[PDB]
Amino acid sequence: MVEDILAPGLRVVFCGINPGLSSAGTGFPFAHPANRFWKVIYQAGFTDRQLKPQEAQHLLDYRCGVTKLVDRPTVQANEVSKQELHAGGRKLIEKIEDYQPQALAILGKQAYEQGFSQRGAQWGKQTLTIGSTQIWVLPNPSGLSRVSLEKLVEAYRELDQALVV
């Protein structure tokens, strides 16, 4: 079971689709060795050192949190159904309304579209918000995504720079 890492006063709450097997197995988010999440948030400015999956709770030190749209673990994210994505959207909205971070970063266009009942979304900052929380759509960092580390870092850095101080 992979627990949420949330608290008040956060800059960003990163939300993935669901847990891969490594994550479900270790209990830490983005635990597969090939997932670029930890390296990306470091190069993009969210953390000042590259955290290892077991140090996930320490993301709070950098005022960042982690959650997921769907709880069910799967080998690949694409194994999650669109109906699952949607039921996850309601609980996610309640969580963000509770914790009130400056921004919610959904990792994956499909995840955003299904969870929030949106269509033809563009990458980056959306006009939709959850209260004062901004909504950003970022590329998924799993090693299975065809996005290069460079594009990943560029996209995440845009968010880091948008949230001043």
From Swiss-Prot:
Signal sequence extent: none
One Pfam family, please name it: UDG
Q: Name one GO cellular component term.
A: cytoplasm
Modes of activity regulation: Subject to strong product inhibition. N-glycosyl hydrolysis proceeds 100-fold faster than product release.
Give a GO molecular function annotation for the protein.
pyrimidine-specific mismatch base pair DNA N-glycosylase activity
Q: What induces it?
A: Induced in stationary phase.
The record's subcellular locations are:
Cytoplasm
Q: Which domain of life is it from?
A: Bacteria
* Reactions it catalyzes: Specifically hydrolyzes mismatched double-stranded DNA and polynucleotides, releasing free uracil
- What EC number is given for this enzyme? 3.2.2.28
A single GO BP annotation from the record?
base-excision repair, AP site formation
Keyword Hydrolase tagged: yes
The entry's family comment says: Belongs to the uracil-DNA glycosylase (UDG) superfamily. TDG/mug family.
Q: What is this protein called?
A: G/U mismatch-specific DNA glycosylase
State the species of origin: Escherichia coli (strain K12)
